[PDB]
Amino acid sequence: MADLAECNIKVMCRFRPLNESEVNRGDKYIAKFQGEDTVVIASKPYAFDRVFQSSTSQEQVYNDCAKKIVKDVLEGYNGTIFAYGQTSSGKTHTMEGKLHDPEGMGIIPRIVQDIFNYIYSMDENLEFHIKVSYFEIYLDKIRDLLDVSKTNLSVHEDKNRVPYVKGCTERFVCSPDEVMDTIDEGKSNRHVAVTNMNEHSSRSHSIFLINVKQENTQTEQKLSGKLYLVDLAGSEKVSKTGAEGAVLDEAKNINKSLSALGNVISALAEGSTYVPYRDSKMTRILQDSLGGNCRTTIVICCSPSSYNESETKSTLLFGQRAKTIKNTVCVNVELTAEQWKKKYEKEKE
C-alpha cells in the first residue's frame, strides 16, 4: 500500500454514458450521483473507493492518473494498468484514451507524451533508452501475431522472474511518432478482426509492454521497469449464444482469465496466504509483474444503456463478483425534499 509498492489505486472507475445518440434513440441510462471520489450507486451492492463520472472534467482525472502510473516507473519496479470496458463506452475514444487533439488526453497519449517530457529534459550524464513491444492473444492461436510468426512468450525465473519479449520485438524506438504507429498501424492490423463495432476488443483483450529506462551510466546503471495497459473485454455468454465458436473463447478464455485476474487483485489486496497462478495465461505472464512487487492502477470504464443494464452490472462485478450478491440493502441517505433533478433547467412557479 504505497506509491512505490503494491496498490489498487482505489479501483478507479469512469463510466461516462453516451448522450445525443442514446437521447435520439430514446434509450435511458442508469446514473444518479456525482463524479468525485465516493459516489452513490443503485440499491444493488457496489464498491468504489475511488470513482469518477461525467464530472471527471477529463484533465482532472487523466492528469492524476498519468502521475500515478509514471511515479511507479521512476521508483516502483514496474507500472501496470488494467482497463475493462465495452464498445459501448467507446474503446477507441474512452478506454484507449486517445484524444484527436491534446487537451486532457487519456492514458495512452499521456504515456507517450508525459514520459517523453522527462526524456526531452534528460541530463547529459544520464543515459536514456526507450524500447517498445506489442503482444496479442487469442484462444484459437494462443500466440502473438506481432512478431508476424506464431510463437509463445516465455518467462525465466532466474534473474527477474518476468516474461521475456520473444522474437526481439522490443526494437529500439526513440521518436513518439514511431511508438504511435505501433499502437494503431501495426497493432490493429496484426490483431484478428471480427464482425462487430470493435473488431479486436469485442472478441479478445489486448496487452502490451513498454520497456523504458531512466538509468545513469555511473550510479543508476539500472533503473525503472516496464509500463503496461491492458484492455479487458468480453461480456458473459448470457444473451448471445448463436455465435458458439465466437462466444466460446469469450466465455472460456476471457471469462477464465477475467475471473483469475480478479482473484489475483482481490486476493493480494486482502492479504491471502496462497500464491496466485490458477494456471491462467494472464495470471502466469503477470504473476510477478502483478504479484504485489510493484504499484498498479485499475481502470474501469462502461457506458450504461437502457438495454445494456447487464453490462453496467458487470462493470462493478470486476472485484465485486463474489461480494456483489449478499443480503445487503443500499439506500440514498442524503435524499432531500428538493427535487434531485429535472428535465429542463428552467423552472416556473
Side-chain angles (χ1 to χ4, degrees), residues 24-37:
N24 289 339
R25 291 180 180 181
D27 289 346
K28 295 180 180 180
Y29 62 91
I30 52 172
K32 179 179 179 179
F33 50 7
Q34 299 299 304
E36 183 178 0
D37 286 347

Side-chain angles (χ1 to χ4, degrees), residues 81-262:
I81 301 169
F82 295 103
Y84 169 78
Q86 185 180 61
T87 185
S88 294
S89 68
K91 179 251 164 65
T92 299
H93 299 289
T94 299
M95 182 166 68
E96 185 178 1
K98 181 177 70 176
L99 265 286
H100 67 85
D101 183 347
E103 255 163 28
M105 316 99 78
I107 291 168
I108 269 288
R110 289 283 183 178
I111 291 166
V112 172
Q113 299 300 315
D114 188 352
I115 292 170
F116 270 54
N117 182 356
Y118 289 92
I119 293 171
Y120 287 107
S121 299
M122 62 184 180
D123 289 346
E124 290 173 348
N125 185 348
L126 269 75
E127 182 177 359
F128 289 83
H129 192 188
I130 306 98
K131 300 174 69 175
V132 298
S133 296
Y134 295 81
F135 299 141
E136 291 171 346
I137 160 54
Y138 253 102
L139 176 59
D140 289 347
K141 266 70 174 180
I142 315 172
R143 293 176 179 180
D144 58 350
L145 298 174
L146 215 315
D147 197 13
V148 197
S149 298
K150 290 180 179 180
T151 63
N152 297 103
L153 300 176
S154 298
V155 51
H156 297 289
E157 67 183 1
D158 186 359
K159 294 180 180 180
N160 289 340
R161 304 185 184 182
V162 301
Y164 286 87
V165 44
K166 183 178 180 180
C168 299
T169 62
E170 64 182 2
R171 292 171 293 177
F172 65 94
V173 180
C174 297
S175 294
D177 289 346
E178 290 172 345
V179 297
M180 182 180 288
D181 289 347
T182 59
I183 291 169
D184 289 345
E185 290 174 350
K187 181 180 180 180
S188 181
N189 183 10
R190 295 294 188 191
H191 202 119
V192 176
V194 75
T195 302
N196 186 267
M197 290 177 178
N198 258 267
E199 291 174 349
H200 48 275
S201 180
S202 77
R203 258 199 70 194
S204 68
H205 56 86
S206 179
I207 178 165
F208 93 124
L209 69 101
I210 299 170
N211 187 39
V212 60
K213 297 180 180 180
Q214 301 184 359
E215 61 191 9
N216 191 5
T217 298
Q218 290 171 329
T219 294
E220 290 173 347
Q221 290 180 6
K222 61 182 180 180
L223 235 300
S224 320
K226 298 180 183 298
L227 193 145
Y228 303 89
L229 182 64
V230 180
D231 290 347
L232 274 95
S235 299
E236 292 174 351
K237 66 181 180 180
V238 67
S239 190
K240 66 182 180 180
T241 303
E244 289 173 348
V247 69
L248 179 62
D249 59 345
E250 290 174 351
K252 181 179 180 180
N253 181 282
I254 290 168
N255 190 32
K256 182 179 180 180
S257 294
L258 177 61
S259 179
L261 290 168

Side-chain angles (χ1 to χ4, degrees), residues 3 7 9-10 12 14 35-37 49-52 56-72 81 104-107 110-111 114 118 295-299:
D3 289 347
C7 188
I9 283 281
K10 306 296 183 180
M12 182 176 71
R14 306 181 299 97
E36 183 178 0
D37 286 347
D49 289 345
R50 184 182 300 280
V51 42
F52 300 98
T56 172
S57 301
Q58 290 172 331
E59 290 172 346
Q60 290 172 332
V61 78
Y62 291 131
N63 191 36
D64 186 351
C65 182
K67 288 181 174 62
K68 293 290 186 294
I69 61 172
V70 170
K71 288 174 181 175
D72 59 47
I81 301 169
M105 316 99 78
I107 291 168
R110 289 283 183 178
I111 291 166
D114 188 352
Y118 289 92
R295 213 260 200 80
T296 185
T297 299
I298 298 171
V299 179

